[PDB]
Amino acid sequence: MIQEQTMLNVADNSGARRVMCIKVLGGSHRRYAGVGDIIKITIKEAIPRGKVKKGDVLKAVVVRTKKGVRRPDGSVIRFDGNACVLLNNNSEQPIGTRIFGPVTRELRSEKFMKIISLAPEVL
Amino acid sequence: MRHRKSGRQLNRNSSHRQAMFRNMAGSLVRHEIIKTTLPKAKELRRVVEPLITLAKTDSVANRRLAFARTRDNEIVAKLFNELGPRFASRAGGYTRILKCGFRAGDNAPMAYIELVDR
Amino acid sequence: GKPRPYSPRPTSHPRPIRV
Amino acid sequence: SNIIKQLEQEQMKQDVPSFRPGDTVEVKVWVVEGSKKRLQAFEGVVIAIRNRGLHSAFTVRKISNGEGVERVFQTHSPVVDSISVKRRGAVRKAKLYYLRERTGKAARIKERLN
Amino acid sequence: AVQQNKPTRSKRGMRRSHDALTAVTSLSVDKTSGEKHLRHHITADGYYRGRKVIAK
Amino acid sequence: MIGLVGKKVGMTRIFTEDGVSIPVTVIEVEANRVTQVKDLANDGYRAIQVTTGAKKANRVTKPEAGHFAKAGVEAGRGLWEFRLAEGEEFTVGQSISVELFADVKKVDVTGTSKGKGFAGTVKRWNFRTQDATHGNSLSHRVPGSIGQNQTPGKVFKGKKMAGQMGNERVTVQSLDVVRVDAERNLLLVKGAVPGATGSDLIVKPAVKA
RNA sequence: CGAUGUCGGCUCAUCACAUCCUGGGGCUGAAGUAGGUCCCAAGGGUAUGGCUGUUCGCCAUUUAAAGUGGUACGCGAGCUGGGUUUAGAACGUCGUGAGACAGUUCGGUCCCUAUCUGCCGUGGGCGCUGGAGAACUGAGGGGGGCUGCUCCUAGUACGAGAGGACCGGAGUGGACGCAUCACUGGUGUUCGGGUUGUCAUGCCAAUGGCACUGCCCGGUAGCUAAAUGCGGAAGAGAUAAGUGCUGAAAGCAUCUAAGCACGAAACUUGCCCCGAGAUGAGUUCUCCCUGACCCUUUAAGGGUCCUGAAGGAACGUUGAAGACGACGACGUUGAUAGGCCGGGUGUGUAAGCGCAGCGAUGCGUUGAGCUAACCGGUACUAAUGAACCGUGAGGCUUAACCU
RNA sequence: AAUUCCUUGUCGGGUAAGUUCCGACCUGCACGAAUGGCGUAAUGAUGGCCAGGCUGUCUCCACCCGAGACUCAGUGAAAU
RNA sequence: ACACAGGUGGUCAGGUAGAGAAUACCAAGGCGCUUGAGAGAACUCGGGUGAAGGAACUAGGCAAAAUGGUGCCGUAACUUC
RNA sequence: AGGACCGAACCGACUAAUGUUGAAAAAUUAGCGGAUGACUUGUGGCUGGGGGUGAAAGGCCAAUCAAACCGGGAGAUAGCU
Ligand SMILES: *[C@H]1O[C@H](CO)[C@H](O)[C@H](O)[C@H]1NC(C)=O
Ligand SMILES: [Mg+2]
Ligand SMILES: [Mg+2]
Ligand SMILES: [Mg+2]
Ligand SMILES: [Mg+2]
Ligand SMILES: [Mg+2]
Ligand SMILES: [Mg+2]
Ligand SMILES: [Mg+2]
Ligand SMILES: [Mg+2]
Ligand SMILES: [Mg+2]
Ligand SMILES: [Mg+2]
Ligand SMILES: [Mg+2]
Ligand SMILES: [Mg+2]
Ligand SMILES: [Mg+2]
Ligand SMILES: [Mg+2]
Ligand SMILES: [Mg+2]
Ligand SMILES: [Mg+2]
Ligand SMILES: [Mg+2]
Ligand SMILES: [Mg+2]
Ligand SMILES: [Mg+2]
Ligand SMILES: [Mg+2]
Ligand SMILES: [Mg+2]
Ligand SMILES: [Mg+2]
Ligand SMILES: [Mg+2]
Ligand SMILES: [Mg+2]
Ligand SMILES: [Mg+2]
Ligand SMILES: [Mg+2]
Ligand SMILES: [Mg+2]
Ligand SMILES: [Mg+2]
Ligand SMILES: [Mg+2]
Ligand SMILES: [Mg+2]
Ligand SMILES: [Mg+2]
Ligand SMILES: [Mg+2]
Ligand SMILES: [Mg+2]
Ligand SMILES: [Mg+2]
Ligand SMILES: [Mg+2]
Ligand SMILES: [Mg+2]
Ligand SMILES: [Mg+2]
Ligand SMILES: [Mg+2]
Ligand SMILES: [Mg+2]
Ligand SMILES: [Mg+2]
Ligand SMILES: [Mg+2]
Ligand SMILES: [Mg+2]
Ligand SMILES: [Mg+2]
Ligand SMILES: [Mg+2]
Ligand SMILES: [Mg+2]
Ligand SMILES: [Mg+2]
Ligand SMILES: [Mg+2]
Ligand SMILES: [Mg+2]
Ligand SMILES: [Mg+2]
Ligand SMILES: [Mg+2]
Ligand SMILES: [Mg+2]
Ligand SMILES: [Mg+2]
Ligand SMILES: [Mg+2]
Ligand SMILES: [Mg+2]
Ligand SMILES: [Mg+2]
Ligand SMILES: [Mg+2]
Ligand SMILES: [Mg+2]
Ligand SMILES: [Mg+2]
Ligand SMILES: [Mg+2]
Ligand SMILES: [Mg+2]
Ligand SMILES: [Mg+2]
Ligand SMILES: [Mg+2]
Ligand SMILES: [Mg+2]
Ligand SMILES: [Mg+2]
Ligand SMILES: [Mg+2]
Ligand SMILES: [Mg+2]
Ligand SMILES: [Mg+2]
Secondary structure, three states: OEOOOOEEEEOEOOOEEEEEEEEEOOOOOOOOEOOOOEEEEEEEEEOOOOOOOOOOEEEEEEEEOOOOEEOOOOOEEEEOOOEEEEEOOOOOOEOOOOEOOOEOOOOOOOOOOHHHHOOOOEO | OOOOOOOOOOOOOHHHHHHHHHHHHHHHHHHOEEEEEHHHHHHHHHHHHHHHHHOOOOOHHHHHHHHHOOOOHHHHHHHHHHHHHHOOOOOOOOEEEEEEEEOOOOOOEEEEEEEOOO | OOOOOOOOOOOOOOOOOOO | OHHHHOOOOOOOOOOOOOOOOOOEEEEEEEEEEOOEEEEEEEEEEEEEEEOOHHHOEEEEEEEEOOEEEEEEEEOOOOOEEEEEEEEOEEOOOOOOHHHHHOOOOOOOOEEOOO | OOOOOOOOHHHHHHHHHHOOOOOOOOOEEOOOOOOEEOOOEOOOOOEEOOEEOOOO | OOOEEEEEEEEEEEEEOOOEEEEEEEEEOOOEEEEEEEOOOOOOOOEEEEEOOOOOOOOOOHHHHHHHHHHOOOOOOOOEEEEOOOOOOOOOOOEEOHHHHOOOOEEEEEEEOOOOEEEOHHHHOOOOOOOOOOOOOOOOOOOOOOOOOOOOOOOOOOOOOOEEEOOOEEEEEEEEEEEEEOOOOEEEEEOOOOOOOOOEEEEEEOOOO
16 A cells, blocks of 8 residues: 555665655556556665666556455455565566565566566465 | 443543442442432443342452452442342342432432342 | 723734735 | 354354464465466464454464565465464464564564473 | 624514423322322332332 | 345355355345235326334234235235336235345345434545644634635535435445345345344345346 | 725635537548547546745646636635734845835734524424325435546558557446445454552452553454445437438529438436425325214304224333434333343453462463453343323315215 | 845756755845954754654544533523 | 632641652642533544554644663764863 | 753743633643843832833833823814714
8 A cells, every 4th residue: 555755665686775656657646556556666775786776767566565465255465564676667567687575466467477477475 | 423332421531430330339239229310320230230240159259359349348248248149049130220300409310229129 | 871991902813904 | 143143154164273373373275377276385473363253364474585474364265275283382462463573583482382 | 703683572482482391291190109200200208100119 | 126125134254165255245035025016097106015024013003904904914014115017917915035036136225324413524525624733723624615705695505514424215236146045035245235234125126237 | 994804725615618538520731540620518527746925837757637717816704824914133225314125034913602694404383174104106306427448359440661440349447426344454541461650458469549541462342444345327318519311492403491310428318315395285005083962143153061082192211313303113912221141252371279489480270260332042120000192974166976 | 145136047966856955156136344254163942954763744534532512400691 | 800720928848669849659638629410413622542654744844743761882073172 | 160961949931722702801731941140039128201211122110101190271173074
């Protein structure tokens, strides 16, 4: 349950460590982004030598949230800290070659298949 | 809204209510009949009758529970010596409320609340 | 009749200034 | 009431083992990919149990690849295949939410002996 | 906020058209003593439904 | 076609074999006895009057008793009417059961919504609260402006304001019928319906379907 | 000018249409995609941030779109008080000076208990023609009406390629609305527990008070959103711009004059709610009352005796009903409330006793004890015999049937 | 610039985005040397700006505890 | 002007905890503040708690939340040392 | 040692909310500044109205201040309402 100003950790090796959501895409007055939803992010913290720089404006897919995801039987899956995977402005494909930590069954699309394959565990 | 809620507030805070019903429970057990406001009498039924119920089984534990409530060994003793065997075969309903007009000072609806075998 | 009027007393709000 | 009870007693599992808050259970849940239907194991500490008949639930917390993960299972759900207590924990609380603000040697429970 | 015009004795009357008291429908008569009393209330001498419940 | 009168027993879930939890409202639809048939000649429209449940003989007034007596049916907790389509036809006494919904896929459930009493504009009309701080004087949950100036110099009819909320007739349309149990006289519909537990529900086949 | 509070914001709007989006069209220097321009269309919808008092504007990033105006540049007896708009102070500047500047700078107060209109709710009265309990009809009124993306049709039509449809169908979202509490959660000073200081219950042990519920950890019912069900429609009628058919006036031509057809989120319906004070007061079903007598200004007259129905009210126990009224349930031929019994739920293994330990404490008895608003039961308590209101066959005229 | 009208000057810093802030520049509308000039550690319920922490300030409110509001009895105002 | 939450100099100074005349709970002693009774709507006031987010609020973090004790360790620019 | 530091009494009054026909003609509540000094406070004294006093705000001089209050000139005058 991510909104404008929300600070997300990075679940990839892009070099970005802390990113801030500056928009929820895909609707007028859209409040929140859950697991799977694409957000617009600015990079607040990054490693010195990386694929992305501090202050860069790009897209990210939210892959873990504290609010978590609900399954059809009523079950819920909650994580400790919100994390996202950085995507391009044009293509919306991952920058990184390695995703860190687990992901959910909500990324099982035709759009985030790289973020499933490179995942150690899919909860 | 107060849907399905129990327990009258009686224009008091929780601590005051608890203290007042502790005193008024002792008063009823001591005198066997008292005159109070009708709503206080209806609430009192939910404080005294469990104490009488509790006082059907005479143990150290139950006397300490009934002391934890009431806080008077003149009331505890009477609950476990006099009232306990008295209502032994009676399945609840130890108290009778009798409406008795209106208080002079504030036109409060008044009632007597007495133990049934008084 | 009418009672003697009071001396000025504290006022809650400033008169609006129109200028 | 008796009608809802008579609806909530026929959907109810009869093979739900005894587990307590602080125990380490292994919940095996069904994962569905179109045709194939396999069992995925989720193992961690039982931090909360909701006893509410058919609506019963329990919350299992594990540290999966650095990031802490809490799964709230619906006890009588057909997606939960098997529950199995791997370790019995000695705690004094019903709810172990305090385990959320601990990591390493601090987030350890003493093994209950009979 | 306050009236711009003095309301009439007529308007005053109309507002008080709902102020009239309702007299007790009727008094119950105890079976033993014979006293009139408020229904579901004890009598003045202390009877309720033919039973002497409180002494004086 | 016609609907049935039921009682909201409460809400449960149905776990499906494919591991999905369907939230269900349990509607107790016991035998609906037709107490009167309206025609075009006498009454002036086609409908049946249904009763359901049982009621205390002493509580049943003589103008209600006679009405049931003419129909030759035991008194129910009330009377409801259902309009007929051109093809439909029922008789006096005829006990209609929940088997009526056997093939019906979606229903409309009408009930008396829970009473919220006197509700503010924030709860009733989703009005936005004003600043909690930043100097706000006694105007945190108040409605704000209720009109414009000298033109029009009045508040318009239908102005959203504080007042009675809920305890009114509400219809939730196009609820999936999950199960129809004729033995236990139960109708299970997917999702929530209006009213408290034990409240009267009128259940009709989907008007939109 | 014996005062009509002035910018911007906030809250809440409401109308216009010169239409921003969505809908329907004509022309195109319209291949397609996408545009341009004009016509019709006001149903619904119509950004969040950075900077600034700003409106605005610039910028960032969205969106189907971020419309233009009116409404005392809508809205301070609704909020704010940053700007402006007193008294303090300073800078630049002007002036010998007091002072001054639509130059700047720091500081600087926002009253009103609502009589009337209006509006949102909710009752009482009387009416509706004998009285009464229900169920209705629906005049009329209100609510609702938004839209993205993906997939199929189809890499088809079209195009040199690049690209890439109409029409039709399917799925899944955003925003908004209604309902609900099964789930996920919040709350839960009425449940359980931990714990600090202190005071008390003679003391030990065990408890209670007070310290924001002392501080906390959990949490039942209820209420609830972030939770999860559902909604916008399809269809129909009459149309707008527009498109036609047949067809003269005008041997031709011509959508029009006669006649005929199609045509949109606008209109009338369809969906949801209110609704017979709809005084034009409607309908249907059922229930109740089938006494005597006297005076007179002989009237739809008054009065006495007898009678008091159906139904209602009142009172009581009350309710997921409620400000109060109201509304619903129940009143012994009784589960209406409280208690009580069983269960559940929550807390988490009471007290006492025993055992181990020097002791704090641990272990056993023991998942113990306690457990609100919950579930299922149960007349133990309180819902009383009465009394009270309401009557006694219901006007005239004229028809059509009946005798 | 507590002084700059033009002006949100220009360039850089900080921010995704900075009419404010900071640093330079000098084109000082209209600084300037005891109506002192320029610095200055410390001090400040002083003005401006940025962070960390923190949060119902806000997204967007929900529930709860109390005092009013509501009903009954007693007393009983006011502006106009 | 009131049996008015204001103002009014000196003296006395118990216990437990505490650095303390702070603070909490008490003693001696003194009080419950001269309308009560119900109810448990909106809204106002004074408080408590809050999912996810964390200044996006706003003129401005206004208000709130937060920090908070003792000992030891450790402590920058700058400086009139 | 100190117009030194933290902090009650005591002196003050930066912010906010409340209150605004108030509990109060300037307060209350929560925070806030000083707290051995250019400190604060009791009692009494002195300064008088174009005069006082003023770490200077035209501040204060009995709820009154760009000339106090009371009585008098006085029925000032009022081309104004
Ligand atoms: C009340 O008005 C007087 C003038 O008559 C003063 O302006 C005073 O400062 C005002 N007070 C408030 C609080 O506005
Ligand atoms: Mg109840
Ligand atoms: Mg009171
Ligand atoms: Mg307390
Ligand atoms: Mg006069
Ligand atoms: Mg006037
Ligand atoms: Mg009145
Ligand atoms: Mg209600
Ligand atoms: Mg808001
Ligand atoms: Mg104010
Ligand atoms: Mg406020
Ligand atoms: Mg007019
Ligand atoms: Mg005037
Ligand atoms: Mg037009
Ligand atoms: Mg229109
Ligand atoms: Mg329409
Ligand atoms: Mg902007
Ligand atoms: Mg405007
Ligand atoms: Mg205006
Ligand atoms: Mg304003
Ligand atoms: Mg106004
Ligand atoms: Mg200002
Ligand atoms: Mg000045
Ligand atoms: Mg105001
Ligand atoms: Mg409408
Ligand atoms: Mg429930
Ligand atoms: Mg919870
Ligand atoms: Mg709690
Ligand atoms: Mg407790
Ligand atoms: Mg002890
Ligand atoms: Mg005490
Ligand atoms: Mg004390
Ligand atoms: Mg249509
Ligand atoms: Mg022709
Ligand atoms: Mg009972
Ligand atoms: Mg249990
Ligand atoms: Mg204990
Ligand atoms: Mg300038
Ligand atoms: Mg900022
Ligand atoms: Mg710049
Ligand atoms: Mg500069
Ligand atoms: Mg100078
Ligand atoms: Mg010189
Ligand atoms: Mg100087
Ligand atoms: Mg009164
Ligand atoms: Mg007094
Ligand atoms: Mg003093
Ligand atoms: Mg003290
Ligand atoms: Mg309250
Ligand atoms: Mg409050
Ligand atoms: Mg708090
Ligand atoms: Mg929160
Ligand atoms: Mg949190
Ligand atoms: Mg943070
Ligand atoms: Mg901001
Ligand atoms: Mg803003
Ligand atoms: Mg502050
Ligand atoms: Mg605080
Ligand atoms: Mg000092
Ligand atoms: Mg001073
Ligand atoms: Mg203070
Ligand atoms: Mg100091
Ligand atoms: Mg100090
Ligand atoms: Mg001056
Ligand atoms: Mg003075
Ligand atoms: Mg003079
Ligand atoms: Mg003279
Ligand atoms: Mg004169």
